[model samples]
Target: GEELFTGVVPILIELDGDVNGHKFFVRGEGEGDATIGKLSLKFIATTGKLPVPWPTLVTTLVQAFSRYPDHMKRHDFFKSAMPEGYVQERTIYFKDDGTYKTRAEVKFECTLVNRIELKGIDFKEDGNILGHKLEYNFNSHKVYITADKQNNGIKANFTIRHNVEDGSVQLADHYQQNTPIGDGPLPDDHYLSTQTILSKDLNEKRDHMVLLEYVTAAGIT
Candidate 1:
């Protein structure tokens, strides 16, 4: 799918199908399991609210992750940053006469900051256990990084928004990074874990004003 615009208005063009629909939503639209069709036009006019450039978003993420200084160490932090099932599944659909319908045989992928994995750690203060995960909020334009100690892993999910005008960006619904540990035989035996869960509405409409600064402040990356 590619982004389209009507006249000076920036629009997003995507394919949708009920049998094989992609991940897209329409306002005031009903839900179902039927294939709509191909080349379904879902027009969304760009609002010149908080224009953000793609480069800025990438740079911010890179820099934010770089703060950890070590890939292995950073990976541990990410594990405690995100939450569970925060990574939304892929979807596709279309807007028909103000109603959203699923398109058949259409699927698209959106890169999510939310990822989970395991890394080796030696520091006892940062703690070590299972892994980490990440979750992103498009409505708030923020990323939640969570770490799982029970299972020894990490996760993270984050929302990225672009400004239609100046290309500046902002992260809205920011959340602080959190970690969970269990009682152990010794204080040092406890593993460091974190969960970056969602605090805002997951169904909120997408906004183009969120920037990376806001995400970092909210403990998102």
Candidate 2:
């Protein structure tokens, strides 16, 4: 089912003490007569402040190389270091007449090494309109770290992938430019990113994460 691509917003929350992470939420109406996908959520995290400064974008990317140290020698030929563990994961949420309350864990994976790599995907066999399938494919390869001198600390450019279902690969390579701070797509000159570090929190899973905040502008093209 195709959901009206209303837009995406970033989610920032202080979870359990200092555990922080960012959530990028896509709000849209499902495709056809079927319910458009419920407002979907994608999550990511890191040790340092998420959506970091621009100049540090390259540094952040360089550090990401360390996360996959095994793949370093193969992809570590750039003049600067890039943030490590850049990933995209999808989770489906159950909705009730426009109200979202719960989510069902589909399937997700982390792929951050090569630019044109197949980034992330979520699959549901039982399949409802929202439970069908989704895939993320990178569109661009020019990687670099960036920051906004004012407003948010950082911003940069990255490819945006689309979600699909069944044999109908509807939304793939949905061009998403620079990501910025706050709950929105990264700005043209800013960086939009999130990181997650795992740990135990009582009986609940806990992690450290943060979302960048973007300054107000006429339009975030």
Candidate 3:
């Protein structure tokens, strides 16, 4: 006998062979993607000729989610942020009574800003922006964002290790937070839940997100 999602991922998913004793539901929300392609094409048209070969919307959104506020400077923004790694580290567990208990709700959507940075300035599609950085002349065309505590930013931790053989501060220690999963009703009905992390009286694993393939481009800058 074993728990819901033992240790590994893929094998556990392929068969659904675990959950030694309990119940679960598998429901899905209808999703789409056609608008995404249109975004990039539209991007080229608006900023036309592509403006400087910036990242595609898909790439940038996930990238922003990946680096998050960490890619940003330290500010009050950290006050309302979480890390992105928890998307993987969380798991489902059972409650002794009727419903299952698991807090692995990696199911909040991102408010992606189609920001275009040119000549060293940030501008979103016109939404929330941090306030302290504002001044009369600095962010002229900029729209202040609400510091959406929703996805304030994603966090990650680093070891910050120094090598003995050769002294090198080669590790980063700043990344350490998780993506914010919004608060929603704990409905036992699978069809009404925020995520497919459905468990009637049992347990289940959360859907994980892909992450940081980080290497900044000086060429683009």
Candidate with top TM-score is: 2
Candidate 1: how many backbone clashes? 65
Ranking by TM-score: 2, 1, 3
37-143 per-residue lDDT for model 1 (tens digits): 00111122133221212222121111112222222233433223222212212111111101111111111122212222111122122111011011222232333
Give per-residue CA lDDT, model 3, range 1-221, as digits (tens). 11111222110011011122312222222221211211111111221122111211112122112111222222222122222212212121111111111222222232122222112122232211111111111100111122224443333322222122233222212222334333211101010000111112123234212211222111111
RMSD of each: 20.0, 19.0, 23.1
**For residues 60-115, could you state the per-residue lDDT of candidate 2 as single tens digits?**
11122111122222222110122221222112122210111121111112211222
Q: Could you tell me the lDDT of residue 123 within candidate 1?
A: 15
Kindly provide the TM-score of model 1 when superposed on the true structure, using C-alpha atoms: 0.20
Residue 146 lDDT (model 1): 52
- Candidate 1 ranges beyond 4 A from true positions: 1-65, 68-142, 166-221
Task: State the local distance difference test value for candidate 1.
Answer: 0.22
Q: How far does residue 75 in candidate 3 sit from its true spot (Å)?
A: 28
Worst 10 residues of 3 by lDDT: 186-195
